[PDB]
């Protein structure tokens, strides 16, 4: 049975929708396939659209994954980490403002460690995106909650930023932050990517999502 | 196989769904309805069988309309009235009401027990205790009164509430609550016709969502 | 086993949504019913909502169907097809304004022809809607895209006016052009329906839908 959304598009799905695929273990699971972009086949693990779901949530709720499938989500860093485990596969960001403006930016390859490794960002090469890099900056960096905190300020980025991210001192992405709608007076607190639309502007729509090499 | 499935949302949570969407559950008949559970509120494992989000559906509508269900799993929709009647008929389903703003306000209400009765009683509201929640309570009032709609005046006025306000409701004389009302997008002039919800926004401010859902004891 | 949606509305699905269905040729589709607009019933195949995916596509992207479950999509051209061959079904174009002002264009009998037939259009005498008819002038002609190019002009149609379509010399709608947003100076390339708003005005909503005789 289908694996990866990469399977799916080559047995003739061409409509993104949520469908199920298996993983290494044999667990089924519904994903949301991206047929679309970029020739397709991808694994959409992010979403932000309207801002009905809260993304300031904690450990337990990151973990095992939450929102819903008609709208934002959070696939879930359990989830994240068996997709993209053994085997490699690459991240694809994609970002429209409220203007209706595409920007991207892909890497080649993006894996997250398990639990015990408190799911390390391990991120290699920008390859290109009219939206710049602002996530190799937090390279080789713990996944931090507002209630785990790993990061490399002194304080917690996590509860200062309003969302759950790799945290250091402190981020230029923050793409679990608050959907603040467009540009903000707040500092760093949106879904924000520094080298995009820089830290008081935040998105319409973000989406994060992998492809195996 | 209408053995071994879920039979609420609530059980399809504890099977270790945890994004909302559509699923499809067994009905106490066995009839399998597909419902759109909403795993994230409040702990999770709710049957929403109203949603309002972005008025694309027109919930102006008759008696038989709002028997079978209408609208769109996409968007805004009623489960029907004898869906729901089916979910709520044995047992206690709590009911939960949500509702948001146009400037990103979130308010709820709460209530002990919910339940429709069938179509032969008019689709009639038995409703618990309000239990908590800052939206208020605007649902009591409407307690062990018939549906209503354009077409079927069983309100407690003499005039005919569904025409007057523009939805279908358990309409007493005659609201103080009006979640099927016209998408009218925040304030309005007119009087008590849109998605309204006396004890939250008032009778001239019609909320950007709304969702009525239920689970198990 | 559920061969339209107009069998699934008999069998009691009132809410429109993705359903899977059954070709006449046993292949499981999953497909945008309408239980809905006038009776309901009605299998959608081309949704423009909100210019989020892009139309302007080649021919092997529209033979197989693109875009999104979540909003904007074409079935494709061998789905669409396999869903018209036998027996005929009924067309009803429905179109919205940015003033949420609907109309409506339908036809007796509605059907295209496989690949080898260039997806050639056969249509049946125009029954009542608002819209008025603009597809009748599109009768009997191939599926044209950017690049192939099937129409009557010495030119490129579809590069001319940026979709793709049944072009003649060259058209009187245009419900695969780009998503221009009300009124536009640009002659012909957007959302156009000539007889209902014109050649300088794009919908905001677009839907072809099909539905047993
Ligand atoms: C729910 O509300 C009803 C009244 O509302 C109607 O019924 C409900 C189900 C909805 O369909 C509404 O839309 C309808 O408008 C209450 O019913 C009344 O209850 C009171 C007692 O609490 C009854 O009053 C008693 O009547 C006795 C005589 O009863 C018989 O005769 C009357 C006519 O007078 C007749 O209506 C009734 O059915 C009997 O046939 C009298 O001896 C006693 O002392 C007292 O006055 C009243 O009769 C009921 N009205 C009706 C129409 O039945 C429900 O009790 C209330 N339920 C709950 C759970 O609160
Ligand atoms: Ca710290
Ligand atoms: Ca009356
Ligand atoms: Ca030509």
């Known amino acids: 049975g289908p694996r990866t959304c990469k399977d799916l598009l080559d047995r003739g799905h061409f409509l993104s929708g949520w469908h199920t695929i298996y993983l290494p273990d044999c667990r089924p699971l519904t994903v949301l396939c991206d047929?679309?972009?970029?020739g397709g086949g991808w694994t959409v693990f992010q979403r932000r659209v309207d801002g009905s779901?809260?993304?300031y949530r904690d450990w337990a709720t990151?973990?095992?994954?939450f929102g819903s499938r008609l709208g934002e989500f959070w696939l879930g860093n359990d989830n994240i980490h068996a997709l993209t485990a053994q085997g490699t596969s690459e991240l694809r960001t994609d970002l429209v403002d409220f203007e209706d403006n595409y920007q991207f930016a892909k890497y080649r390859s993006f894996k997250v460690?398990?639990?015990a490794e408190k799911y390390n960002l391990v991120l290699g090469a920008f390859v290109e995106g009219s939206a710049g890099d602002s996530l190799?900056?937090?390279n080789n960096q713990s996944f931090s909650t507002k209630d785990q905190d790993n990061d490399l300020n002194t304080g917690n980025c996590a509860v200062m930023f309003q969302g759950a991210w790799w945290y250091?001192?402190?981020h230029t992405s923050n793409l679990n932050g608050r959907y603040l709608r467009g540009t903000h007076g707040?500092?760093?607190?949106?879904?924000?990517w520094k080298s995009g639309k820089g830290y008081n502007?935040?998105?319409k729509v973000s989406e994060m999502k992998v492809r195996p090499a």
């Open 113 to 115: 460690a398990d639990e």
């Open 62 to 65: 990151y973990k095992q994954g």
């Open 201 to 203: 502007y935040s998105y």
């Open 186 to 192: 707040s500092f760093a607190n949106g879904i924000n």
């Open 136 to 138: 190799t900056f937090h």
């Open 35 to 38: 047929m679309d972009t970029d």
């Open 53 to 55: 779901v809260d993304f």
């Open 168 to 170: 250091k001192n402190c």
